[PDB]
Amino acid sequence: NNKETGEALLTPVDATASSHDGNGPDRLIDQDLTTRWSSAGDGEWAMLDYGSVQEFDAVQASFSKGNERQSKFDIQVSVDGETWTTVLENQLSSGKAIGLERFQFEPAVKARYVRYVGHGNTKNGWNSVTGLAAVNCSINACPASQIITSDVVAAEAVLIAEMKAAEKARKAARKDLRSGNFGVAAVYPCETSVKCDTRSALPVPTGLPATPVAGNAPSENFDMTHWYLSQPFDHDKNGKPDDVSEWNLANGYQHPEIFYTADDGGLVFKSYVKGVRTSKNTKYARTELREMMRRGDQSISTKGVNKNNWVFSSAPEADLEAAAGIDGVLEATLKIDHATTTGNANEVGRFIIGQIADQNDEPIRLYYRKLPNQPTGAVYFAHESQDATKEDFYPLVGDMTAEVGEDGIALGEVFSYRIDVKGNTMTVTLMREGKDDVVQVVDMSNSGYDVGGKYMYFKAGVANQNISGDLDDYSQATFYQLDVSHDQYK
Numbered sequence: 001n002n003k004e005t006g007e008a009l010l011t012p013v014d015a016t017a018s019s020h021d022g023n024g025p026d027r028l029i030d031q032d033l034t035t036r037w038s039s040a041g042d043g044e045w046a047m048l049d050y051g052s053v054q055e056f057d058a059v060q061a062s063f064s065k066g067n068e069r070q071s072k073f074d075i076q077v078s079v080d081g082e083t084w085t086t087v088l089e090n091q092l093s094s095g096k097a098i099g100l101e102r103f104q105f106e107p108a109v110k111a112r113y114v115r116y117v118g119h120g121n122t123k124n125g126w127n128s129v130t131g132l133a134a135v136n137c138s139i140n141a142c143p144a145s146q147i148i149t150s151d152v153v154a155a156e157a158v159l160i161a162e163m164k165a166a167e168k169a170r171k172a173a174r175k176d177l178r179s180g181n182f183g184v185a186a187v188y189p190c191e192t193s194v195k196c197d198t199r200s201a202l203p204v205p206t207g208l209p210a211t212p213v214a215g216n217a218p219s220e221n222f223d224m225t226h227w228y229l230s231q232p233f234d235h236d237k238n239g240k241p242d243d244v245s246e247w248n249l250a251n252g253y254q255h256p257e258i259f260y261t262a263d264d265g266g267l268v269f270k271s272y273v274k275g276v277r278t279s280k281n282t283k284y285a286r287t288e289l290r291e292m293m294r295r296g297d298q299s300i301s302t303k304g305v306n307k308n309n310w311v312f313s314s315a316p317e318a319d320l321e322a323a324a325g326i327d328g329v330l331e332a333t334l335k336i337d338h339a340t341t342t343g344n345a346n347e348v349g350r351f352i353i354g355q356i357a358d359q360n361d362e363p364i365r366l367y368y369r370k371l372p373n374q375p376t377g378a379v380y381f382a383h384e385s386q387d388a389t390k391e392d393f394y395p396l397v398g399d400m401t402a403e404v405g406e407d408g409i410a411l412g413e414v415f416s417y418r419i420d421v422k423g424n425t426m427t428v429t430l431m432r433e434g435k436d437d438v439v440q441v442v443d444m445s446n447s448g449y450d451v452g453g454k455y456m457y458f459k460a461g462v463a464n465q466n467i468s469g470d471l472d473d474y475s476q477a478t479f480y481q482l483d484v485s486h487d488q489y490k
């Protein structure tokens with residue numbers, strides 16, 4: 001009954017979404033395979049509004065990276081846009097095509113609103129769709145080619161090649177930003193002024209002022225014995241960030257461009273778009289601290305369930321004991337001085353200010369994000385779970401669209417955060433003077449961070465999440481508190 005021919009599809013009057021990352025729902029109906037609506041988390045939806053009641057019996061949808069993974073979804077319809085009928089369930093896209101694919105049901109239904117309800121894909125927890133449309137196969141083309149068969153794949157070959165040549169060019173443009181050949185020359189206390197005993201633990205700093213003081217080195221305002229600093233320039237030309245070890249940081253290290261005490265005592269981190277990066281697994285530069293519970297004793301390794309890292313108290317007994325501590329609290333107070341104003345729809349204005357990471361994934365990445373056109377910014381966080389097959393975002397002040405108007409956190413405004421892990425429960429709190437705390441509690445029982453062999457460390461500072469803006473654009477934050485604690489086994 002399906003024909004190769006038919007009249008034009010209806011144009012939706014409105015496309016909306018429960019959420020997105022800046023790649024908004026307007027990108028579903030633009031017929032461009034080069035744009036996408038993206039959102040993360042089971043049950044997130046995009047909705048086509050047709051303006052009045054119409055008749056449909058199918059949808060056509062093209063999928064972001066549709067040839068590398070399969071998306072999972074339902075489709076639902078409504079007359080009122082309050083009561084929802086499910087017409088297609090546990091659909092799985094083909095994984096073989098980036099062009100349109102049809103998902104058809106019998107019989108037709110009457111609806112004004114049609115909704116895509118996403119359940120991630122087979123690789124990660126993202127719902128990412130390049131085109132969606134409700135279709136009536138009595139009047140509209142429902143061609144054969146939208147059923148993905150070997151010959152549809154062969155027919156995609158020219159499109160695939162052109163996409164890949166554009167990927168390749170962007171990858172080359174990104175590579176040009178990564179020389180690390182910039183910034184004034186660093187001065188390392190361990191090479192210049194201090195004999196550093198890298199086979200011992202640093203002393204515990206005492207007499208740290210309650211409020212950071214201008215003209216103090218960061219290690220005089222904060223306990224810098226349990227961090228190393230990742231710096232985005234590469235002055236010894238090994239292709240890697242020039243890292244500042246705990247013995248250096250704890251003896252007064254500062255870099256006057258990117259890591260230094262401000263004129264009110266705050267610790268400033270600045271991160272440009274440009275720089276070398278920590279590995280091929282990220283696209284982004286960072287100017288960020290990485291927790292080192294060995295605290296300067298370099299006989300202990302950086303990586304491993306060992307005396308440099310902690311574990312959740314819900315981990316197996318062997319891990320609980322082999323770790324330097326169990327559970328953890330990071331508490332920080334800071335203000336954002338500047339957010340990138342250039343870059344693409346999901347990256348502009350976005351960076352990370354706190355993390356907990358294991359070898360591969362992040363139990364949390366705390367973002368701040370300000371859009372160049374909004375007068376305040378958003379703070380929200382991600383919990384990645386189940387070996388990175390799942391990802392959920394939780395708002396704190398606004399959400400990942402960062403469309404907060406006047407209601408978010410302004411450049412210059414001081415606020416606090418707390419990341420608190422006790423076993424398989426993470427509590428994240430956002431504090432602001434004269435306002436109520438905002439709290440999100442994350443149940444991690446099924447997150448798989450207690451399975452055994454996973455080691456944890458905190459991070460704080462500014463990890464850029466923008467590789468697409470101008471090379472010299474930057475994001476910058478000033479911290480006034482950085483307090484880390486852990487429990488001990490028995």
Ligand SMILES: O=C(O)[C@@H]1O[C@@H](O[C@H]2[C@H](O)[C@H](O)[C@H](O[C@H]3[C@H](O)[C@H](O)[C@H](O[C@H]4[C@H](O)[C@H](O)[C@H](O[C@H]5[C@H](O)[C@H](O)[C@H](O[C@H]6[C@H](O)[C@H](O)[C@H](O[C@H]7[C@H](O)[C@H](O)[C@H](O[C@H]8[C@H](O)[C@H](O)[C@H](O[C@H]9[C@H](O)[C@H](O)[C@H](O)O[C@H]9C(=O)O)O[C@H]8C(=O)O)O[C@H]7C(=O)O)O[C@H]6C(=O)O)O[C@H]5C(=O)O)O[C@H]4C(=O)O)O[C@H]3C(=O)O)O[C@H]2C(=O)O)[C@@H](O)[C@@H](O)[C@@H]1O
Pocket residue numbers: 021023037038039064124126127128230240243277278279280281282283284290298300301302303346352357359360361362365463
């Ligand atoms: O539809 C869609 O799908 C679309 O998706 C959406 O996009 C989102 C998706 O999620 C998407 O997947 C993507 O996600 C990516 C994002 O990037 C995201 O933020 C996230 O990023 C994470 C990842 O984890 C990522 O991998 C990276 O991790 C960082 C991590 O933060 C840490 O930095 C960590 O650091 C490591 C690392 O190896 C690093 O290089 C470094 O190694 C150093 C260091 O100095 C160590 O101390 C150690 O030192 C040793 C050395 O040998 C040293 O020389 C010395 O040696 C000693 C020693 O004794 C020796 O043996 C010898 O005798 O000599 C001595 C001497 O010489 O001194 O000391 C040693 C020692 O052990 O002490 O190792 C060195 C070294 O160089 O090896 O530090 C380690 C460390 O652990 O500290 O890892 C890095 C890393 O890169 O791995 O970033 C994070 C992050 O910041 O977030 O995940 C990404 C992903 O791809 O999964 O993007 C998302 C978004 O964009 O949002 C949307 O696009 C949507 O629109 C679409 O729909």
